[PDB]
Amino acid sequence: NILEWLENPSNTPDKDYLLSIPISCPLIGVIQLAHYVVTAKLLGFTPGELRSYLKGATGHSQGLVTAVAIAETDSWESFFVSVRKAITVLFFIGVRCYEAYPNTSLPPSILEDSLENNEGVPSPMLSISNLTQEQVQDYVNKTNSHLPAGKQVEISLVNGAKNLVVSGPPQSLYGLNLTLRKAKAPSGLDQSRIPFSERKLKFSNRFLPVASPFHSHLLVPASDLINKDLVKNNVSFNAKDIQIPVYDTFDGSDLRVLSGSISERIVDCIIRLPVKWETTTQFKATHILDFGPGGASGLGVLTHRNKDGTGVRVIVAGTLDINPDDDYGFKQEIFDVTSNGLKKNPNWLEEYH
Amino acid sequence: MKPEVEQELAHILLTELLAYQFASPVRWIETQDVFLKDFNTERVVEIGPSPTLAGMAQRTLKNKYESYDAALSLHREILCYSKDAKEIYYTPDP
Amino acid sequence: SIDAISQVINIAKAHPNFPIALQWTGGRGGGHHSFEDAHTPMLQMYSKIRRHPNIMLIFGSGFGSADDTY
Amino acid sequence: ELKPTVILKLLKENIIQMEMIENRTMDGKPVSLPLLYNFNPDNGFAPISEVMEDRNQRIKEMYWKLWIDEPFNLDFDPRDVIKGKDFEITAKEVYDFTHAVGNNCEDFVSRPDRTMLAPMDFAIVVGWRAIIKAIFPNTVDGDLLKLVHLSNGYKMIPGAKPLQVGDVVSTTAVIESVVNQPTGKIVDVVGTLSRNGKPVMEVTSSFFYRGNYTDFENTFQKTVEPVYQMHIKTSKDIAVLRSKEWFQLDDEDFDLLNKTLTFETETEVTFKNANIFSSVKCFGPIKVELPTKETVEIGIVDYEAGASHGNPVVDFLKRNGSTLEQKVNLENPIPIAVLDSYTPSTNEPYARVSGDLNPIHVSRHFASYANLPGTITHGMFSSASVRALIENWAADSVSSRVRGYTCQFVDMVLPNTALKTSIQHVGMINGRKLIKFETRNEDDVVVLTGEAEIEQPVTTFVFTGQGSQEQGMGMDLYKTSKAAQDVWNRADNHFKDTYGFSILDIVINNPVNLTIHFGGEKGKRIRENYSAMIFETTEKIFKEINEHSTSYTFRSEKGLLSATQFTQPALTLMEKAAFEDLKSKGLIPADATFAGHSLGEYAALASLADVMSIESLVEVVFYRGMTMQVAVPRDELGRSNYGMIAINPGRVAASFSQEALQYVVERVGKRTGWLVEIVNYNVENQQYVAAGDLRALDTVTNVLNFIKLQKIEEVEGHLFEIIDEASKKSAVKPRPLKLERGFACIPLVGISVPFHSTYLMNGVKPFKSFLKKNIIKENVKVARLAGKYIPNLTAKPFQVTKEYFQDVYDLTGSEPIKEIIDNWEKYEQ
């Protein structure tokens, strides 16, 4: 009962129930679509007009559903059709992926140990920073050598050069975290008097605020159920109706060009295949609009970090705020009619040629 | 087998095992492996005046099971009667 | 080191109009040398440096010709 | 939907019927409870009066339609056993139950490559129809609308696995007791769940019919009494016991003097009225403790009487014996956690999953007619919810570790109420932890209390061998513990009576010399015991002792406690005393596996399997050390030419594996011809022990020193060059030579015999015969050993199987074994 929670902030469920995917996926989609609608209306555009002003669209994991829905919109009188399509896809993904791998209680000793060692509350996804994929895969391989096939972990998101997320059962990721804790150096440790080659690796790790192991082998059995539900509910995406290229999260290719079912591919990308953000974002552009959730701690800022120095500007389209370094934009930038609306980031090769 | 026959054979094997013990080598590597990996023993309690076998078990853990214990989240405990009396008796300090 | 570069950036920020010549050198240089690699600190701090137009980036510690400096 | 709940009309010209309807039934058809009333206009003040006759029958018929799927019949004996329908546990039912009660453990969730288990609470859904049918019979008459559930409990049967999806379960119920108390009638029911013919777990439930009952002819009781322990000191006690007609020994001539007796009885009484029994029957086995602390039966208790005011047997046992309590409390309770829980807004889902379709939990009108505070929550839901809390916190979310759980329903609880559960570890019982809990509602009123029995983590016991003794070993425990005191005093008394010394004196004072005096008859007897010792391999140990010896003197340099014959018994006694103290504290897990390093095997086999009594244990340990002493040739100075060396291969060379050490030792004992071998494999590539002539250890120590100092068929030939070089460089020294060290080789102090070596292979079979005289045939229990004991010889769990029997041959040959293996088929049949 979303409207009741919105009008009455006290009848709203607790945070953990809101974070479960059968709730989370549809509501994140709704948030993205609401931001898109606000952006279009404040600019006087129909959704088709705003889409036409775009050169392309894409999404990080779940956002791929919203991106395709946006690419199909034409007029305000038919926007709810694509809204229904996207929300239905997200609803069925959430329901079937929660039925495939529901969460269960964690032994309190594990939570106590994680909290004592300044680690997050364990969850089905662990983000690792400052390590390369090669390195993280070696650790994952050694951890998987002991676990059985159904408790394996794997690299789910390649968010950057030294930014990776590993998905799997919360306890397998806790064991991986123990192994990593036995391979890290304290942040305080000064190594200024140690030759560079001999210095120990300082790298971060934390559990993400999520409630399902996405892009993992655990959710595969939900794929057929989701595809049957989408068919029974008459939800499909036709390449002739997508008017801007939508980039696949696994290989960065145009989904329109793909021959099979686009919805099946999107579901496969969300639940099974890993996400390579850089391969997907290898497109050329001067500006990137982030309608996602999370404000300045979301997808837009990560992409900015990955594309710094290449003259690409990122605007967080879902938040109004002032950035001190002004290295990325906020909601005000999209509607500013003066020159401050158009801000370009530095391309070093050209600026210091 | 009938219980009496089983007892007879068990006694024969036991008395034989003991007679031949002071002549054969003490296979402690295999014993430690058996009760650290095939049993996943969570508590090792050492009965004796000094922590000898407990230290041996700790060294065995630090050399063959660092990865296995972490991967399976096995948090083993090694207790010697001479020093870890509180943990054995569950008599925590006030 | 990184901290030294941050302090140089702060100096350049306090005086945005004065030219500041940032002379970066790795531990590979002759004379008194540090323990730092010659490239990772630059890969880390190049963006921060370039956000200040009054800082001039000079690279040293191991050059001898136009071919290896190009 | 809007449905009829109460219909009121005139059934007859004078009879007012108030039919109360329940719409949440087991087949969807409403069930009505017709309540009848008389209308008497002549009594204007109170025209209406209830028809009390058949009222309870009507209430029970309604409850039978709601709970029991069988033809309505109240005419069956409460004394009979109730048989329930076979129940097949499926994944859907486990899912529904766990979601209804809020259990989030992962054991009960479908997961790949794992079988799904059912929670212990599922026993009630499996056996509810059998358990609740116990309070229906006509003889146990009461108003089911005033029924109160007082308590419920589960008890896993030892050695049984937990319930699991796919299992077919049969249930059986019997009424333990039904007693008319002044304020109502209590009915005690015991349900038994069986799987594949074997029983799995037992369910106990106490039910209360509130009201006034005086039909004592229908009541009976059955109580299992506490175990009573009696120590028979004098002939006066024997005379007192024999005067009792109920004290019946199987062997009338049994010698009870200086024996400990335990009485395990059960009392079955029937009541003539509130205070007087119409019949009393007390019966059970009498057993005597054996020297291995084992109890065997020697007689029975039986007592029968008519009208009586009490039980004389238990009165006598209480007055003259001691009570044995399996529960032992920790020094102080250990707080586990305080948790918060909530009752659901509706009782319908739990009712529908458990089958308990009682209208007071779902119907407003029925609850109001019952004078209840509202539509109360099932007490069983609260029990399941608190047990889920305990399982997660007290057992660390390991289902199987919960073996017992009981709850007392103290006060009622209403829907949408916040509960507050405090869990704590208070004691132990047979290796399991005792968990108390208490649940308070928002007004701080206790509504639920109970106990849980949680297994400890998988445990192993390892017993240290020789080399760690010290003056005062185990003496503090001897000061404090009674079990330790009993162990040492039995050993000391035996040593004093047999060999004329006290082991406790040696442990406490560590004398340098000890003389035994043979004056008098006792002395002569001790001299005989000394003379009878032999080292068939038939040399006599103590060759100087003869029929003219008046005394003998054990000698040493630093202390006799560091002498083998006295060292081994002291260590064995200290370890056994420690383990017996642990046992007296309810601290030993029943499935614990054990092993012993060298002399440790004996302490371990005595501590965990009670294969031999204390007096037998110390004799074998004393003889074992005595044979070792006279197993090597010693000069007049007691300095032999054999020793032991501790080696650390990883210290001589980082790439020197144990197969590399095994190479050097075998080659150093091959090209030189002297006796040397690895006796202990302690830590892989970090700790090894070699035994042999003290001379041949110096060459090994030197050879490794050459390997460490330098970077080291050709390989075999090259090593032969090294062995020869060091071989002569130490042979020159006198026979009682000195072993020094390498960077990684450190000899042991005080060791002169190469035990755990092929040297002592001749004097083995005679030692086997000696053990057979001391470890008796009947004292071995295979359940105590099978799968738990790990021998140093064959480092595999003790299994009585043809593969194990074949295995012992491979290491060391044995004539009896090949007979067993060859005739293994004869023994099987």
Ligand SMILES: Cc1cc2nc3c(=O)[nH]c(=O)nc-3n(C[C@H](O)[C@H](O)[C@H](O)COP(=O)(O)O)c2cc1C
């Ligand atoms: C012989 C010699 C003397 C130097 N003296 C100084 C000095 O007095 N002060 C200083 O700041 N750097 C000094 N340096 C460092 C260099 O000026 C410069 O920072 C850098 O190390 C040159 O790197 P290269 O030797 O690889 O070309 C000296 C270097 C050399 C080889």
